C-alpha cells in the first residue's frame, strides 16, 4: 500500500528534521515541506558551519535578489566528501537542486548523523515516536509524489 509507504517515509523525514533542529538549535518548519525547504542550501550550509567553527562559510539567503542555490549546496557536498564518507551515503546537486531525489538527501542526512554520532561528534538521530503521525493530506501528497516519479526510496533500515 502506497499510504503505508508514505507514512514510513514521512517518519524518516521527521527524524532527519528533528536531528538538524537539535543540531542547529532551531525550529525548521513542518515535516511535509522540509525537503523543499532544503533546496536553497541554507540549512545544509549551516550544518557545515557548525562542524567547521575555524572556517568562515559565506552562506547566501538574500531576500532582495536571487542567490545561487548550488553555492550553499556545494558547501554541504564538499563537507561530506572532505570527511571521507563513502559516495553511497551522499546525494548529488541535481537530486536537491531540481528535487529529483529528495529522499536521497534525507538518507544522506541520516547517514551523516550516524557517522557523526558514532564518532560522538554530535547527538544521534532518534527513531520517531511510535504514535507519531501526520495528516492524511501530507501522506496523500507523498503518495502523489511517488506516483509522479521513478525514484525508489533509500534503505534507512540498513543504516
Ligand atoms: Hg512511520
Ligand atoms: Hg543533532
Ligand atoms: Hg531561492
Ligand atoms: Hg551523506
From Swiss-Prot:
* Annotated ranges, domain Calponin-homology (CH): 10-116
Q: Where in the cell is it found?
A: Cytoplasm, Cytoskeleton; Nucleus envelope; Cytoplasm, Cytoskeleton, Microtubule organizing center, Spindle pole body
Q: Which domain of life does the protein's organism represent?
A: Eukaryota
What is known about its subunit structure?
Interacts with calmodulin cam1.
Give the domain section of the comments: The IQ domains provide the interaction surface for the myosin light chain MLC1. The calponin homology (CH) domain binds to actin filaments.
- Give the function comment from the record: Component of the contractile F-actin ring; required for its construction following assembly of F-actin at the division site.
Quote the protein name from its UniProt record. Answer: Ras GTPase-activating-like protein rng2
Q: Which organism is it from?
A: Schizosaccharomyces pombe (strain 972 / ATCC 24843)
